[model samples]
Target chain A: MKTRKGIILAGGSGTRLYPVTMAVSQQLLPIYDKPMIYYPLSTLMLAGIRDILIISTPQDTPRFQQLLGDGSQWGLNLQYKVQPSPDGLAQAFIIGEEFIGHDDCALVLGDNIFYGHDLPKLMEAAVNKESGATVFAYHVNDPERYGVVEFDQAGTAVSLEEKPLQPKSNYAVTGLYFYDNSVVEMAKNLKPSARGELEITDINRIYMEQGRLSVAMMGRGYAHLDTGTHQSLIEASNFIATIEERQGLKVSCPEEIAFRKNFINAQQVIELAGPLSKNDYGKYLLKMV
Target chain B: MKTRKGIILAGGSGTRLYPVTMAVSQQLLPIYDKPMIYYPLSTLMLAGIRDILIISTPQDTPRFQQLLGDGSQWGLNLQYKVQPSPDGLAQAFIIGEEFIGHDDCALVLGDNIFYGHDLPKLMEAAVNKESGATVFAYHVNDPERYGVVEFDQAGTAVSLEEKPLQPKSNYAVTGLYFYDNSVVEMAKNLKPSARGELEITDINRIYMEQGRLSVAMMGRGYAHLDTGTHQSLIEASNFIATIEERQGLKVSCPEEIAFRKNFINAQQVIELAGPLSKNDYGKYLLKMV
Candidate 1:
């Protein structure tokens, strides 16, 4: 397996969530039992990415540090950077340039939640393969709200559009993205969009133009929730609760994932579980052993 | 329907939860998208108990007030009181003496969570019954840690013991209790046990002595979680998640319950749903119309 780094884009005003977000960032909200950011963090950890970078707004960055810290407890080197503005998604590449440091990296959006039993293995395999850039495509009822990606008859990536009025397909790109070292340069060369922010679609288009972009279809059981709005936030909660309850397992558990990947020893895992021992979140951690 | 009052016991040090509880009480923790207290509050509302009193520790009382308020939003009268000490459960009747007044009242433990499809109807039916003290008994694997209630061959309440070393049966009494106004006097006359705290078991025993305590058995599918320890807390979460996911509906939603019971009008229900409109919880609430 190849060594991979990870970057989580956690910067956002979370205006869509309004009153709730007014006090706390959407990423800090609890998804089931753990904070929402834990899902993306665990996603990267499961992919065998040891060195991680978390990008957040200036005001909320310190809170993330308070919660996650250096990530040494999980045997990973964690770094933090400030996005400073509600810029487009593409800005993460430039912000995380130092953390990526010439290595292939996986970039996942902070509030974007993904859940599937085999997701960890799929992420690890995707990160290991030699590829130009890899992104996941999931089928959702409404694809017009997201960047729509269409494939040709030969199953080749033909075009990508940002929130098109008439979507070419029902398939929408999820937040998880993989890229090689060239992504930093691609981001630098990109111009600001009509929205005045560097759009991630442009960087993906560059990869597509070079025939270096690959699209992976997420499984049918997988769920990708957009927590950008009040309704979607609740929907995300419902989606996770429904699946987690039915399966009797957690959708995104960082401690469990870290221990499973041997990123941290059993004692460290138990130590983490000890504090949460009074609730189901803690019980689930303790049962991991 | 006869008018009745409700008491929500939200008091606890929450020491077991540590960092999470260090800032907020366990009852204030989010079960999914709503605070954990919402479920129990809805449970009472569903039972037609609109005049509610919330009893919490000094620190948590204000937070509860900020969240639920005077209950006028839901067309219910809400009040708050402080428990100053970590006294045992039976102390609630004494502390809430003024609130209970001359009316019968129901006591629902703050951390004691319950969920089932038929729960609303069950609670409503339990509240309507005219004569005795009504309490629920659930079958749990570990009954020793709870107040155990055992019935005879004729299904009569023959034995009741608190945290007995040797439980007579697998049925443990749930946290909810229904009593007449005499409960206040009963609580006042109670003596502290070896643990130096007034026990609710003593109050129930007093009713049992007069054959006025009726035990309602909550059979399979009914969940009663005692969030007292680490293991049980996880069990509670698992139990709730299991049912919510399988049903694609919420278990303890107060707004929905209040609307369904006609305690609050449909317009008020819609207003409550407006804030949560983005998620399935909001969708469920919207569909109530």
Candidate 2:
């Protein structure tokens, strides 16, 4: 296993979310108190990925850089890249090639939110895959809207269908993926679909064909949410609020994740909590002391 | 059009929501600031129905009564009934028979939430129907989970299927329903389904067989939310928060609804807002002056 790097794709114009995302990336919208991107970024940090590349639209890249900064406050290396145009999911690897270098990388969509007792362990397992790729699958009510994945009795992926009309199973491929250094090359050879965009499904198919693809089901205990539509966006926020308030512990809490991962000490965590002291969220951060 | 009496079924055990509704009824949970029942009640009020019969479990009835008094505050008639055990949706009409008398009826699930500028007018239009039945339909991403309604080009519902394996359309029947006075007799004659309960789908099916079921589509501007799941409960809350925060207006504000509908006077709304003046919700209510 190698030290895994992370990339967050926050580049979408968010046409589905409309007026709310008209002036901002949907990832910048608050799920509860924190921005939607915080969930994905924290998911990365939880997996012990300190180096992250956030790719967003040209108009939104500076704002993400401003909001997340150098990530030093949380003791992580965070960089920003502009996608320039709305490309496909596989474009993240090509955009962050230099940063990824020869290291394994995990890609997470900024608008996706995940929560579960088993999530941290699952992320670690996915990130530590030594070869090929690991694509997470989750059971969603509507599987027709996403890339469908099916695994054999051995729990290795045998087929990858992009928005299958007839889903093999209820498992929809979630917006997080882990790949070895060969991913950049796999993405490079991908042909654009009729829509004229390189498809991530094509890249995953290569891994599956090479028999190097594995599947990890997030299970019913885990909540893998999509924040693509306004209803779903609010649903994601509400899910976070419910869990956070119910447990009296934050979900996708970046500062706390960094501190727990040992990237930042208790003192640093407390210092980070100071500026956020007034609100309930900041108060929760301060309580870590 | 006959005067419409409203029945709000808050009787479910809410096993789907589990521990959240363990001790209390799910309808008492806060969607935003107000309890879940408020949304349905406000919907009924918005439909120009002042006479409401709220049916709940024996354990949850007092709480409902306490949250909403005799309804005199809002210039409405409110009554409560106890469903000794978990019955079914169609059981509401049987429980609310006396309340319905010779009038038409509107039944709304207490845990269902709705928001949209068009909703009030739509509800009014639905209630004003001289005969037949009105089942409001909204386009949802996952129609298979719902009682799906498919419409012809004329926009009239040609079919209604309960939890169809393959939905013909994305339109799902929302929780609110309007029916003629004969619905009480129809509900009374309902045979127990395979589940041994009078199903709402059976009621709708009966109307469909009679060619008396008309569909009212809640357009893009509307939101018809489900609160049966923990995730949806919070999403409903966040959605309320977002809309209320954005428009500087509350979604399920009873006093505001009553005042605007002329069910109560401005003085009455101001008086109702008095005791609630301490919280931000109350502050918003007070601002309506």
Candidate 1 local distance difference test against the native = 0.79
Could you tell me the lDDT of residue B207 within candidate 2?
89
Q: Write the per-residue lDDT of candidate 1 for residues A58-136, one digit (tens) a residue.
A: 8788878887889897888899999888778888989888777778888999987877767876776688765688889
Query: Model 2 Cα displacement at A195 (Å)?
Result: 2.5
lDDT of each: 0.79, 0.79
Best of the candidates, DockQ = 1
Tens digits of per-residue lDDT for model 2 on A100-184? Answer: 9999999998878888898889878787777988888888889988889887787667888888778887788888889999999
Q: Which ten residues in a row have the lowest lDDT in candidate 1 chain A?
A: A15-24
Listed in order, each prediction's TM-score against the native is: 0.72, 0.53
